[PDB]
Amino acid sequence: PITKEEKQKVIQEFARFPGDTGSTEVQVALLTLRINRLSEHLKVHKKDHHSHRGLLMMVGQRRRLLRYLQREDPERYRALIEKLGIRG
Amino acid sequence: AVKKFKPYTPSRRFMTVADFSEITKTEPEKSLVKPLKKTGGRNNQGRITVRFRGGGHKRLYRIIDFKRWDKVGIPAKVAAIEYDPNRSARIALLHYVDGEKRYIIAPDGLQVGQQVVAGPDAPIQVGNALPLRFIPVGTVVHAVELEPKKGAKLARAAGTSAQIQGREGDYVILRLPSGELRKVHGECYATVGAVGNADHKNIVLGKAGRSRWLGRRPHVRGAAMNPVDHPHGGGEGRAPRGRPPASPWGWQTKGLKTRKRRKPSSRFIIARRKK
RNA sequence: GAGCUAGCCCUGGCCAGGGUGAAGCUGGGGUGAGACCCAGUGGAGGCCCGAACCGGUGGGGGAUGCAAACCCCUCGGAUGA
RNA sequence: CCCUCGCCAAGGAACUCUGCAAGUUGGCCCCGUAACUUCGGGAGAAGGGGUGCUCCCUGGGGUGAUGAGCCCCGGGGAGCCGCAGUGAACAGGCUCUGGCGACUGUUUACCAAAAACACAGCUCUCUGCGAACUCGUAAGAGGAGGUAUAGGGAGCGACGCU
RNA sequence: CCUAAGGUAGCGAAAUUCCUUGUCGGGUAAGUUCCGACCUGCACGAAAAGCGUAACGACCGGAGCGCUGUCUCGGCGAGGG
RNA sequence: AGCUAGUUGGUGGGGUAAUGGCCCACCAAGGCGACGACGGGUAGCCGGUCUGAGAGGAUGGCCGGCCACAGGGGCACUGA
RNA sequence: GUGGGAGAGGGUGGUGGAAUUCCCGGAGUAGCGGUGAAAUGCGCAGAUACCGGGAGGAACGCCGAUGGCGAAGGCAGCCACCUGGUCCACCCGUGACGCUGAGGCGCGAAAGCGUGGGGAGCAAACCGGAUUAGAUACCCGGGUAGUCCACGCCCUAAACGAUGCGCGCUAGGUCUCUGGGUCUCCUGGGGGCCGAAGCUAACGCGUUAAGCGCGCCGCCUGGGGAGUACGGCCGCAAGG
RNA sequence: GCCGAGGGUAGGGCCCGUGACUGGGGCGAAGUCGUAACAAGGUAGCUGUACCGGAAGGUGCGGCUGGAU
Ligand SMILES: [Mg+2]
Ligand SMILES: [Mg+2]
Ligand SMILES: [Mg+2]
Ligand SMILES: [Mg+2]
Ligand SMILES: [Mg+2]
Ligand SMILES: [Mg+2]
Ligand SMILES: [Mg+2]
Ligand SMILES: [Mg+2]
Ligand SMILES: [Mg+2]
Ligand SMILES: [Mg+2]
Ligand SMILES: [Mg+2]
Ligand SMILES: [Mg+2]
Ligand SMILES: [Mg+2]
Ligand SMILES: [Mg+2]
Ligand SMILES: [Mg+2]
Ligand SMILES: [Mg+2]
Ligand SMILES: [Mg+2]
Ligand SMILES: [Mg+2]
Ligand SMILES: [Mg+2]
Ligand SMILES: [Mg+2]
Ligand SMILES: [Mg+2]
Ligand SMILES: [Mg+2]
Ligand SMILES: [Mg+2]
Ligand SMILES: [Mg+2]
Ligand SMILES: [Mg+2]
Ligand SMILES: [Mg+2]
Ligand SMILES: [Mg+2]
Ligand SMILES: [Mg+2]
Ligand SMILES: [Mg+2]
Ligand SMILES: [Mg+2]
Ligand SMILES: [Mg+2]
Ligand SMILES: [Mg+2]
Ligand SMILES: [Mg+2]
Ligand SMILES: [Mg+2]
Ligand SMILES: [Mg+2]
Ligand SMILES: [Mg+2]
Ligand SMILES: [Mg+2]
Ligand SMILES: [Mg+2]
Ligand SMILES: [Mg+2]
Ligand SMILES: [Mg+2]
Ligand SMILES: [Mg+2]
Ligand SMILES: [Mg+2]
Ligand SMILES: [Mg+2]
Ligand SMILES: [Mg+2]
Ligand SMILES: [Mg+2]
Ligand SMILES: [Mg+2]
Ligand SMILES: [Mg+2]
Ligand SMILES: [Mg+2]
Ligand SMILES: [Mg+2]
Ligand SMILES: [Mg+2]
Ligand SMILES: [Mg+2]
Ligand SMILES: [Mg+2]
Ligand SMILES: [Mg+2]
Ligand SMILES: [Mg+2]
Ligand SMILES: [Mg+2]
Ligand SMILES: [Mg+2]
Ligand SMILES: [Mg+2]
Ligand SMILES: [Mg+2]
Ligand SMILES: [Mg+2]
Ligand SMILES: [Mg+2]
Ligand SMILES: [Mg+2]
Ligand SMILES: [Mg+2]
Ligand SMILES: [Mg+2]
Ligand SMILES: [Mg+2]
Ligand SMILES: [Mg+2]
Ligand SMILES: [Mg+2]
Ligand SMILES: [Mg+2]
Ligand SMILES: [Mg+2]
Ligand SMILES: [Mg+2]
Ligand SMILES: [Mg+2]
Ligand SMILES: [Mg+2]
Ligand SMILES: [Mg+2]
Ligand SMILES: [Mg+2]
Ligand SMILES: [Mg+2]
Ligand SMILES: [Mg+2]
Ligand SMILES: [Mg+2]
Ligand SMILES: [Mg+2]
Ligand SMILES: [Mg+2]
Ligand SMILES: [Mg+2]
Ligand SMILES: [Mg+2]
Ligand SMILES: [Mg+2]
Ligand SMILES: [Mg+2]
Ligand SMILES: [Mg+2]
Ligand SMILES: [Mg+2]
Ligand SMILES: [Mg+2]
Ligand SMILES: [Mg+2]
Ligand SMILES: [Mg+2]
Ligand SMILES: [Mg+2]
Ligand SMILES: [Mg+2]
Ligand SMILES: [Mg+2]
Ligand SMILES: [Mg+2]
Ligand SMILES: [Mg+2]
Ligand SMILES: [Mg+2]
Ligand SMILES: [Mg+2]
Ligand SMILES: [Mg+2]
Ligand SMILES: [Mg+2]
Ligand SMILES: [Mg+2]
Ligand SMILES: [Mg+2]
Ligand SMILES: [Mg+2]
Ligand SMILES: [Mg+2]
Ligand SMILES: [Mg+2]
Ligand SMILES: [Mg+2]
Ligand SMILES: [Mg+2]
Ligand SMILES: [Mg+2]
Ligand SMILES: [Mg+2]
Ligand SMILES: [Mg+2]
Ligand SMILES: [Mg+2]
Ligand SMILES: [Mg+2]
Ligand SMILES: [Mg+2]
Ligand SMILES: [Mg+2]
Ligand SMILES: [Mg+2]
Ligand SMILES: [Mg+2]
Ligand SMILES: [Mg+2]
Ligand SMILES: [Mg+2]
Ligand SMILES: [Mg+2]
Ligand SMILES: [Mg+2]
Ligand SMILES: [Mg+2]
Ligand SMILES: [Mg+2]
Ligand SMILES: [Mg+2]
Ligand SMILES: [Mg+2]
Ligand SMILES: [Mg+2]
Ligand SMILES: [Mg+2]
Ligand SMILES: [Mg+2]
Ligand SMILES: [Mg+2]
Ligand SMILES: [Mg+2]
Ligand SMILES: [Mg+2]
Ligand SMILES: [Mg+2]
Ligand SMILES: [Mg+2]
Ligand SMILES: [Mg+2]
Ligand SMILES: [Mg+2]
Ligand SMILES: [Mg+2]
Ligand SMILES: [Mg+2]
Ligand SMILES: [Mg+2]
Ligand SMILES: [Mg+2]
Ligand SMILES: [Mg+2]
Ligand SMILES: [Mg+2]
Ligand SMILES: [Mg+2]
Ligand SMILES: [Mg+2]
Ligand SMILES: [Mg+2]
Ligand SMILES: [Mg+2]
Ligand SMILES: [Mg+2]
Ligand SMILES: [Mg+2]
Ligand SMILES: [Mg+2]
Ligand SMILES: [Mg+2]
Ligand SMILES: [Mg+2]
Ligand SMILES: [Mg+2]
Ligand SMILES: [Mg+2]
Ligand SMILES: [Mg+2]
Ligand SMILES: [Mg+2]
Ligand SMILES: [Mg+2]
Ligand SMILES: [Mg+2]
Ligand SMILES: [Mg+2]
Ligand SMILES: [Mg+2]
Ligand SMILES: [Mg+2]
Ligand SMILES: [Mg+2]
Ligand SMILES: [Mg+2]
Ligand SMILES: [Mg+2]
Ligand SMILES: [Mg+2]
Ligand SMILES: [Mg+2]
Ligand SMILES: [Mg+2]
Ligand SMILES: [Mg+2]
Ligand SMILES: [Mg+2]
Ligand SMILES: [Mg+2]
Ligand SMILES: [Mg+2]
Ligand SMILES: [Mg+2]
Ligand SMILES: [Mg+2]
Ligand SMILES: [Mg+2]
Ligand SMILES: [Mg+2]
Ligand SMILES: [Mg+2]
Ligand SMILES: [Mg+2]
Ligand SMILES: [Mg+2]
Ligand SMILES: [Mg+2]
Ligand SMILES: [Mg+2]
Ligand SMILES: [Mg+2]
Ligand SMILES: [Mg+2]
Ligand SMILES: [Mg+2]
Ligand SMILES: [Mg+2]
Ligand SMILES: [Mg+2]
Ligand SMILES: [Mg+2]
Ligand SMILES: [Mg+2]
Ligand SMILES: [Mg+2]
Ligand SMILES: [Mg+2]
Ligand SMILES: [Mg+2]
Ligand SMILES: [Mg+2]
Ligand SMILES: [Mg+2]
Ligand SMILES: [Mg+2]
Ligand SMILES: [Mg+2]
Ligand SMILES: [Mg+2]
Ligand SMILES: [Mg+2]
Ligand SMILES: [Mg+2]
Ligand SMILES: [Mg+2]
Ligand SMILES: [Mg+2]
Ligand SMILES: [Mg+2]
Ligand SMILES: [Mg+2]
Ligand SMILES: [Mg+2]
Ligand SMILES: [Mg+2]
Ligand SMILES: [Mg+2]
Ligand SMILES: [Mg+2]
Ligand SMILES: [Mg+2]
Ligand SMILES: [Mg+2]
Ligand SMILES: [Mg+2]
Ligand SMILES: [Mg+2]
Ligand SMILES: [Mg+2]
Ligand SMILES: [Mg+2]
Ligand SMILES: [Mg+2]
Ligand SMILES: [Mg+2]
Ligand SMILES: [Mg+2]
Ligand SMILES: [Mg+2]
Ligand SMILES: [Mg+2]
Ligand SMILES: [Mg+2]
Ligand SMILES: [Mg+2]
Ligand SMILES: [Mg+2]
Ligand SMILES: [Mg+2]
Ligand SMILES: [Mg+2]
Ligand SMILES: [Mg+2]
Ligand SMILES: [Mg+2]
Ligand SMILES: [Mg+2]
Ligand SMILES: [Mg+2]
Ligand SMILES: [Mg+2]
Ligand SMILES: [Mg+2]
Ligand SMILES: [Mg+2]
Ligand SMILES: [Mg+2]
Ligand SMILES: [Mg+2]
Ligand SMILES: [Mg+2]
């Protein structure tokens, strides 16, 4: 799995203010994290169709926030997806 | 893998070629090659004694190590994996820490840069050689000797494997590539693993010319000949066989057994093959 | 008797010029990543047209011949078994 | 009269076993191109336009030096002549529709080139290796310095559905 | 009644159909050939493979356009005899 | 289910009472489409008429308005 | 976010025993098998029944449940790794970021197809024996695809709860699974039964609505012809 | 001299009428054969698919209850 420690760094490098967990920024960043791992899991386990739905939900989930974030502060949108390397 | 071609010529449409991905060295090791005397299928009398042979690509013969009990306890690194025109299987260049270089036929799974060793003490891992008695019952093995120190004779073609079944005194029990069940002496060396290049059989030659490159001339059917030439010869128009299908020499060719019955190795074959 | 002819073995040599444009690769697009689509590059093939060279489809001539199998026109293959 | 060749009013295959033979078409450039299809093809499908020469204007490239010159690949305009401009020579006639063989190949040197042989591909069958099988009285060889994803024998003959 | 068992799919007047120029349809002014059908298949039929199949063929059929001394139907001319 | 070479726009001219690719030359790579382009089918449109509780449905002969045509097409001349 | 939970949810790799079959050694004799009764079949060339050895494949008994999980198809020995959904408590973070969803994309039981393996049991086709008027069946003896594995296709169903998703509101009793509490019981989330009001043509539904309401989607418009034809797209074919 | 009604050559697209023969469909009916479904319909039914059979159908595999007891 992802570990507690491994996850905090993500929470820590994306937080808007000192105490932050779960702002759009952190939210996307946390999601980008599980996504990219599942992607690599399915790369090997091509027959794990059930967990692909998970992936498609997460990919769907992150997508809807990015639209929110891109709507409110465009300057901030392009900032997060650069640090995360996301568009395609 | 196997590489297909787009149908840009009529013959390309079906032709498939080997993938050659496991190859890391495109040149044979000079001090281990020697010239192949092509025979054309003709013997020292000059007579064709195996019909329809000749005119294939020139080949340099790679000297292979079918002994390996030659160097017990001296390990070697896998330096490369090479193409050998004289077999279905691929070959592995070993650099012994001894400094000496040898070829063996390449097992499946072998890695460029790994190490292998032969002897009573070798770990049971891919590429090692041991007398059959020290390989655990049930593990699959290749390059098996038939009598001790006589050389590896069995399981040498691409993708093949023999498997150890059980033991009985001085002898172990092998299931050969053909499914036959045989006793082989326990001092017969063998190499753990199966032979590589298993995708070999899925190769579609593709056109007459490919066979020609392989040194295989066209085969002419008996039915297309005359009675002087062949049992199936002659007749006006096409004709059925009109007798039990026979070879050019007259023996029965559909079903008839030919192994010598009183052959001494009979005491050692448990079950004749299958399928 | 294989200095003709047939097959094979060893070692050399030869195939004007033009055309078509496979994979691959690079860039662009696409997607979660892909599959894939497009462009350029590329130069594959018992691929195409056609000399040499190897043949011998049709027709005509020849028929005590130029010739005990030739001549003319035409036609098949021409990187390949 | 014969051979080899040239032309021909009107007709245009009515010739004949058969358009046999001979006309036609013919190179390059541009436009354009159907059924069907294994998506490659079918395709040079078909069909049509252009083609010489003179003058004026201009574009890219090679060797120079970045320029002159020399050489290569073009674009645009206006004009001249003849029956006719790949003006001579070399250089496809086309289409529709069945049979047979999938295809390139091979064959009766010297009456048959094919629907015949071969062919990739499919199946049956033999062979545990001093293999089977083949040649040889034998020795010795081929098989194979190969080892059942390998080797022999036989039938069928891409591929699809069987 | 008989057999070891009684020809399945597909195809069929066929490189196979004797009677035969079978019958009907198409094409032609007129078609013993050709194409499409029918089926009492003299005597198809499933690896001596069955029914199809794009591409290919100096293979063998049938038709049309183009164009012609092939023909009506022959004429003149050249050169070697 | 994709359509488009006068095609979509620019410039310069031609043309008319007058705008305009209406027409020509040059230049740019554009214009239209599921809010249905393109294509096929059908119909001249309206005031109104008919029916219907209304909403709606059906319709456009007579009469009034507009359009289009004058054997089938093309073209101009005279002329406000 | 933090901290916890239950589960045949999914993928990979291993591994355990029961049983069937075949082979081998033993010992043993005249029958075994099967049905309604029989025959086919197997058996003195030594079967069945019994003991020991071995080979191989498929499916997991008890637990097991009116249970659990998944969006659906579906998922059951056990072990490890990789991975998804989901509930709970705290009320810590973001601040309407939501709902639905024409096209699109993916998943999708069985059978079926392609290439290669594997093949113990079972078993379309097929053979034989019975039954019968006939028996191209039902019953019995045999038996090939297939059923299993890998990769790639097909995309259908009584693919069902014959019930699209989300949200809010409208009595309760009881049984069960799974979190949390102040552990009588209270509170959440799933799985059944009976029932308030109401709905319904009736049957029945009823806080898991088929009730009272809003949003968006898909769908219906007499039976047959017909899920056919033609066109179109998809597929190797079957065919969708 | 350009454009130009249209005439002519060549190849394509949609539609309509028609065709030896052929595929099933509707109706007719007083015909032949069997009895598949409705009762446990005398082998519970239906189902997608696959193979087979004169015909309804049968059987395999999986599914549903819209199955008596
Ligand atoms: Mg999520
Ligand atoms: Mg975005
Ligand atoms: Mg490989
Ligand atoms: Mg290929
Ligand atoms: Mg290729
Ligand atoms: Mg390819
Ligand atoms: Mg080709
Ligand atoms: Mg081909
Ligand atoms: Mg190979
Ligand atoms: Mg190869
Ligand atoms: Mg390789
Ligand atoms: Mg040397
Ligand atoms: Mg040698
Ligand atoms: Mg010698
Ligand atoms: Mg000699
Ligand atoms: Mg031989
Ligand atoms: Mg030979
Ligand atoms: Mg090799
Ligand atoms: Mg092959
Ligand atoms: Mg060779
Ligand atoms: Mg061969
Ligand atoms: Mg042959
Ligand atoms: Mg022959
Ligand atoms: Mg002969
Ligand atoms: Mg002889
Ligand atoms: Mg003789
Ligand atoms: Mg003989
Ligand atoms: Mg014979
Ligand atoms: Mg003869
Ligand atoms: Mg013969
Ligand atoms: Mg004869
Ligand atoms: Mg013969
Ligand atoms: Mg004959
Ligand atoms: Mg013959
Ligand atoms: Mg024949
Ligand atoms: Mg004969
Ligand atoms: Mg025969
Ligand atoms: Mg004979
Ligand atoms: Mg005979
Ligand atoms: Mg031996
Ligand atoms: Mg010679
Ligand atoms: Mg010679
Ligand atoms: Mg040489
Ligand atoms: Mg050449
Ligand atoms: Mg060339
Ligand atoms: Mg060249
Ligand atoms: Mg490269
Ligand atoms: Mg790329
Ligand atoms: Mg390219
Ligand atoms: Mg080029
Ligand atoms: Mg080339
Ligand atoms: Mg060639
Ligand atoms: Mg060529
Ligand atoms: Mg060529
Ligand atoms: Mg020369
Ligand atoms: Mg010569
Ligand atoms: Mg020759
Ligand atoms: Mg000749
Ligand atoms: Mg000629
Ligand atoms: Mg002659
Ligand atoms: Mg001649
Ligand atoms: Mg002569
Ligand atoms: Mg000549
Ligand atoms: Mg020529
Ligand atoms: Mg030539
Ligand atoms: Mg050529
Ligand atoms: Mg060539
Ligand atoms: Mg070469
Ligand atoms: Mg060669
Ligand atoms: Mg004339
Ligand atoms: Mg004339
Ligand atoms: Mg004519
Ligand atoms: Mg004419
Ligand atoms: Mg005549
Ligand atoms: Mg003719
Ligand atoms: Mg001719
Ligand atoms: Mg000519
Ligand atoms: Mg010419
Ligand atoms: Mg010519
Ligand atoms: Mg056509
Ligand atoms: Mg095409
Ligand atoms: Mg054709
Ligand atoms: Mg042309
Ligand atoms: Mg054609
Ligand atoms: Mg031309
Ligand atoms: Mg001139
Ligand atoms: Mg130079
Ligand atoms: Mg210069
Ligand atoms: Mg020309
Ligand atoms: Mg001239
Ligand atoms: Mg000349
Ligand atoms: Mg000339
Ligand atoms: Mg030519
Ligand atoms: Mg001609
Ligand atoms: Mg044609
Ligand atoms: Mg022809
Ligand atoms: Mg014929
Ligand atoms: Mg044929
Ligand atoms: Mg032939
Ligand atoms: Mg041929
Ligand atoms: Mg074929
Ligand atoms: Mg051939
Ligand atoms: Mg050739
Ligand atoms: Mg050719
Ligand atoms: Mg040829
Ligand atoms: Mg040929
Ligand atoms: Mg001769
Ligand atoms: Mg000859
Ligand atoms: Mg001779
Ligand atoms: Mg002779
Ligand atoms: Mg001769
Ligand atoms: Mg001759
Ligand atoms: Mg000949
Ligand atoms: Mg020829
Ligand atoms: Mg000849
Ligand atoms: Mg031949
Ligand atoms: Mg042949
Ligand atoms: Mg075949
Ligand atoms: Mg095969
Ligand atoms: Mg002999
Ligand atoms: Mg002898
Ligand atoms: Mg010897
Ligand atoms: Mg030897
Ligand atoms: Mg040797
Ligand atoms: Mg060998
Ligand atoms: Mg062939
Ligand atoms: Mg042949
Ligand atoms: Mg043959
Ligand atoms: Mg086909
Ligand atoms: Mg019998
Ligand atoms: Mg007939
Ligand atoms: Mg006839
Ligand atoms: Mg026929
Ligand atoms: Mg035919
Ligand atoms: Mg016949
Ligand atoms: Mg006849
Ligand atoms: Mg006759
Ligand atoms: Mg008559
Ligand atoms: Mg007649
Ligand atoms: Mg007629
Ligand atoms: Mg005629
Ligand atoms: Mg007639
Ligand atoms: Mg007639
Ligand atoms: Mg004829
Ligand atoms: Mg004839
Ligand atoms: Mg016919
Ligand atoms: Mg008849
Ligand atoms: Mg025959
Ligand atoms: Mg034969
Ligand atoms: Mg036969
Ligand atoms: Mg044949
Ligand atoms: Mg045929
Ligand atoms: Mg054929
Ligand atoms: Mg054909
Ligand atoms: Mg040919
Ligand atoms: Mg030919
Ligand atoms: Mg003509
Ligand atoms: Mg004359
Ligand atoms: Mg004269
Ligand atoms: Mg003259
Ligand atoms: Mg004269
Ligand atoms: Mg004269
Ligand atoms: Mg305009
Ligand atoms: Mg213009
Ligand atoms: Mg109209
Ligand atoms: Mg009208
Ligand atoms: Mg009303
Ligand atoms: Mg109206
Ligand atoms: Mg009216
Ligand atoms: Mg009026
Ligand atoms: Mg008018
Ligand atoms: Mg009138
Ligand atoms: Mg008029
Ligand atoms: Mg008018
Ligand atoms: Mg006036
Ligand atoms: Mg026993
Ligand atoms: Mg006895
Ligand atoms: Mg036992
Ligand atoms: Mg659930
Ligand atoms: Mg708060
Ligand atoms: Mg959708
Ligand atoms: Mg499925
Ligand atoms: Mg399945
Ligand atoms: Mg099948
Ligand atoms: Mg299969
Ligand atoms: Mg298989
Ligand atoms: Mg029976
Ligand atoms: Mg019976
Ligand atoms: Mg029966
Ligand atoms: Mg049974
Ligand atoms: Mg099969
Ligand atoms: Mg299956
Ligand atoms: Mg259900
Ligand atoms: Mg449900
Ligand atoms: Mg439904
Ligand atoms: Mg219903
Ligand atoms: Mg919905
Ligand atoms: Mg609703
Ligand atoms: Mg509780
Ligand atoms: Mg608790
Ligand atoms: Mg509850
Ligand atoms: Mg439950
Ligand atoms: Mg209730
Ligand atoms: Mg009530
Ligand atoms: Mg309740
Ligand atoms: Mg209702
Ligand atoms: Mg009606
Ligand atoms: Mg209806
Ligand atoms: Mg359908
Ligand atoms: Mg259906
Ligand atoms: Mg259709
Ligand atoms: Mg015009
Ligand atoms: Mg016109
Ligand atoms: Mg006119
Ligand atoms: Mg009709
Ligand atoms: Mg009809
Ligand atoms: Mg009818
Ligand atoms: Mg009944
Ligand atoms: Mg029943
Ligand atoms: Mg029934
Ligand atoms: Mg069924
Ligand atoms: Mg019958
Ligand atoms: Mg049955
Ligand atoms: Mg279900």
Curated annotation (Swiss-Prot), chain A:
This is Small ribosomal subunit protein uS15. Part of the 30S ribosomal subunit. Forms a bridge to the 50S subunit in the 70S ribosome, contacting the 23S rRNA. Keywords: Ribonucleoprotein, Ribosomal protein, RNA-binding, rRNA-binding. CDD domains: Ribosomal_S15p_S13e. One of its GO terms (molecular function) is structural constituent of ribosome. Belongs to the universal ribosomal protein uS15 family. The gene is rpsO. It comes from the Bacteria.
UniProtKB/Swiss-Prot annotation, chain B:
Gene3D superfamilies: 2.30.30.30, Nucleic acid-binding proteins, Ribosomal protein L2, domain 3. Coiled coil: none annotated. GO terms for molecular function: rRNA binding; structural constituent of ribosome; transferase activity. GO terms for biological process: cytoplasmic translation. GO terms for cellular component: large ribosomal subunit. It holds the Pfam family Ribosomal_L2_C. The keyword RNA-binding applies. Residues 222-275 are annotated as: Disordered. It comes from the Bacteria. SUPFAM superfamilies: Nucleic acid-binding proteins, Translation proteins SH3-like domain. InterPro entries: NA-bd_OB-fold, Rib_uL2_dom2, Ribosomal_uL2, Ribosomal_uL2_bac/org-type, Ribosomal_uL2_C, Ribosomal_uL2_CS, Ribosomal_uL2_dom3, Ribosomal_uL2_RNA-bd_dom. Residues 229-239 have a biased composition (Basic and acidic residues). One of the primary rRNA binding proteins. Required for association of the 30S and 50S subunits to form the 70S ribosome, for tRNA binding and peptide bond formation. It has been suggested to have peptidyltransferase activity; this is somewhat controversial. Makes several contacts with the 16S rRNA (forming bridge B7b) in the 70S ribosome. HAMAP family: Ribosomal_uL2_B. Belongs to the universal ribosomal protein uL2 family. This is Large ribosomal subunit protein uL2. It comes from Thermus thermophilus (strain ATCC 27634 / DSM 579 / HB8).
